[PDB]
Design a protein around this ligand. Structure first.
Ligand SMILES: OC[C@H]1O[C@H](O[C@H]2[C@H](O)[C@@H](O)[C@@H](O[C@@H]3CO[C@@H](O)[C@H](O)[C@H]3O)O[C@@H]2CO)[C@H](O)[C@@H](O)[C@@H]1O
Ligand SMILES: OC[C@H]1O[C@H](O[C@H]2[C@H](O)[C@@H](O)[C@@H](O[C@@H]3CO[C@@H](O)[C@H](O)[C@H]3O)O[C@@H]2CO)[C@H](O)[C@@H](O)[C@@H]1O
Ligand SMILES: [Ca+2]
Length: 516
């Protein structure tokens, strides 16, 4: 893995449950059988959406956690674990969606103004999640829901491995910038979603707050605004993405815009930790979408990420760390294209995020964006997960592998692995002052023969007089590897003579000794 390390000792694989309730796609008895089968293939837990629209449908505090409790019972019956997602966002509701569970209709009546929803540059209204600007309604409703859910789930704390929160549309911390109704779907540039009167007013007050008066605002922006009402969000999103973002005004508006998401993160994290910590004592996480299109567009750089709220990922990740939430990146199986008209750079994106998350010490989890039907995609996921320190990977979705034994087998082999600590020892290494010894091998866990950034570093044991290291390998998998010397200048000097193997990697910790 990157810099000389191996796969994450805590790596675990999870399977995403279907969108519809179990009794609609199968029955409780078969479901438990499916869970034991998934468990057999390396899956540690089942992640599942518990819809707000289902749990507090009829009215304020009129809760219904019966489904969630019944689901948990079957998970306990199958000897599995579960990761519930408190889904405060809408399910489906489009042409031929596999679900349609809007957030409780009574919630929209809590306000007379337009503070609860989003309005795009072109006036498209979006109501699939509450606008993070309405922090008062969010603090009340989310706090109530999280606390009620914790109480209801208290008896099943033993099968709960982690809890996910929905930070926005599709369960991700972002703005609903890419939708068909707004004409911003892939691979198009997104649209800013801060055009409600409430949003305009907040931006205005935010600006006046940091500068004090319009005279100070005009000094900083180098503008000539006549009145405070002239303080508005981008009138032309395309022009703003082309060059407006570079201005002092552009930096300020983007700071406010992403800032709303950062504050939402800290709010929901605070409410969640208040509600779940004492009782469950499990990790809590949220998701960040993989907005890979328009990434490297020449004229509108990052034209889809910015409207979604992603301007500075480092500053964004800082919010996750302060809120004490683990991060889940939802796009691991794709590769970079970077060509017109999509300008899609999925892999570079993931690499950037992983690097940042790791520098900050944020536990990182991954997920595939679209259903995988080819082994090659599993291979791409393995490279990112095993070389960029991912603590876990969730497979979307259930039915894809549950009803396809072949795909299930390739998953078990490639991704449904159990990390195990082993000691690799190499004797007779002809090293010179400044020579470092590494090992690389066939599987993604060994860097796939890469000698540049993915090799695993060994260390000289002064006592035993040799090179060895505690490497984490996938248990019960056949591996092949060779040690190699890297000169002072970072170039490969030589390779071990005979190629080594471990068929398979032992389930128990031992050592593999070989001569140069
Ligand atoms: O709140 C002030 C002002 O903000 C908005 O106008 C922005 C515009 O969205 C930005 O792209 C940027 O545009 C400038 C305009 O001058 C050109 O010569 C430059 O090439 C662009 O970079 O800045 C302006 C404000 O300075 C909003 O559209 C507007 O209604 C509002 O009054
Ligand atoms: O927020 C949900 C989801 O959005 C993004 O997914 C992208 C995806 O990365 C694109 O390749 C593209 O896929 C479409 C999805 O619809 C199918 O019918 C088409 O066949 C695919 O080509 O668009 C989606 C949606 O914009 C994001 O990448 C992802 O991380 C996130 O979870
Ligand atoms: Ca409530």
């Amino acid at each position: 893995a990157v810099n000389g390390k191996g796969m994450n000792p805590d790596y675990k694989a999870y399977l995403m449950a279907p969108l519809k309730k179990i009794p609609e796609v199968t029955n409780w008895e078969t479901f438990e059988n499916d869970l034991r089968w998934a468990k057999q293939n390396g899956f540690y837990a089942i992640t599942v959406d518990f819809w707000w629209g289902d749990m507090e449908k009829n009215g304020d505090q009129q809760f219904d956690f019966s489904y969630a409790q019944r689901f948990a019972q079957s998970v306990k019956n199958a000897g599995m674990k579960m990761i519930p997602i408190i889904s405060t966002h809408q399910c489906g509701g489009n042409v031929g969606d596999d679900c349609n569970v809007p957030i409780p209709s009574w919630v929209w009546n809590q306000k007379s103004d337009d503070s609860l929803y989003f309005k795009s540059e072109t006036g498209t209204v979006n109501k699939e999640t509450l606008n993070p600007l309405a922090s008062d309604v969010i603090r009340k409703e989310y706090g109530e829901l999280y606390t009620a859910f914790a109480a209801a789930m208290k008896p099943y704390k033993d099968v709960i491995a982690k809890i996910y929160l929905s930070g926005g549309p599709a369960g991700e911390l972002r703005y609903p910038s890419y939708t068909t109704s707004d004409g911003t779907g892939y691979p198009s540039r997104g649209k800013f979603q801060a055009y409600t009167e409430f949003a305009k007013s907040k931006f205005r007050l935010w600006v006046l707050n940091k500068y004090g008066s319009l005279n100070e605002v005009n000094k900083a922006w180098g503008t000539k605004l006549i009145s405070e009402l002239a303080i508005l969000p981008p009138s032309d999103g395309e022009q703003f993405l082309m060059n407006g973002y570079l201005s002092m005004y552009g930096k300020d508006y983007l700071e406010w815009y992403q800032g709303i998401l950062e504050n939402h993160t800290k709010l929901i994290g605070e409410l969640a930790h208040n509600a779940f910590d004492t009782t469950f004592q499990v990790p809590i996480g949220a998701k960040i979408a993989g907005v890979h299109w328009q990434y490297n567009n020449p004229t509108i750089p990052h034209g889809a990420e910015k409207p979604a709220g992603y301007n500075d990922y480092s500053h964004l990740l800082d919010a996750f760390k302060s809120a004490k939430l683990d991060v889940t990146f939802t796009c691991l199986e794709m590769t970079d294209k970077g060509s017109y008209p999509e300008y899609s750079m999925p892999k570079t994106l993931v690499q950037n995020i992983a690097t940042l998350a790791n520098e900050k010490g944020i536990v990182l989890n991954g997920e595939n964006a679209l259903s995988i039907g080819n082994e090659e995609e599993y291979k791409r996921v393995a490279e990112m997960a095993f070389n960029y320190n991912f603590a876990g990977f969730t497979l979307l979705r259930y039915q894809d592998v549950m009803y396809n034994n072949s795909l299930m087998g390739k998953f078990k082999d490639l991704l449904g692995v159990t990390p195990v600590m082993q000691t690799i020892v190499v004797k007779n290494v002809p090293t010179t002052i400044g020579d470092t010894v590494y090992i690389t091998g066939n599987r993604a866990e060994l860097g796939s023969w890469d000698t540049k950034q993915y090799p695993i570093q060994l260390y000289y044991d002064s006592h035993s007089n040799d090179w060895r290291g505690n490497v984490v390998l996938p248990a019960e998998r056949n591996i092949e590897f060779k040690a190699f010397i890297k000169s002072k200048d970072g170039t490969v000097k030589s390779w071990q003579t005979i190629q080594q193997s471990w068929n398979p990697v032992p389930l128990k910790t031992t050592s593999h000794t070989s001569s140069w």
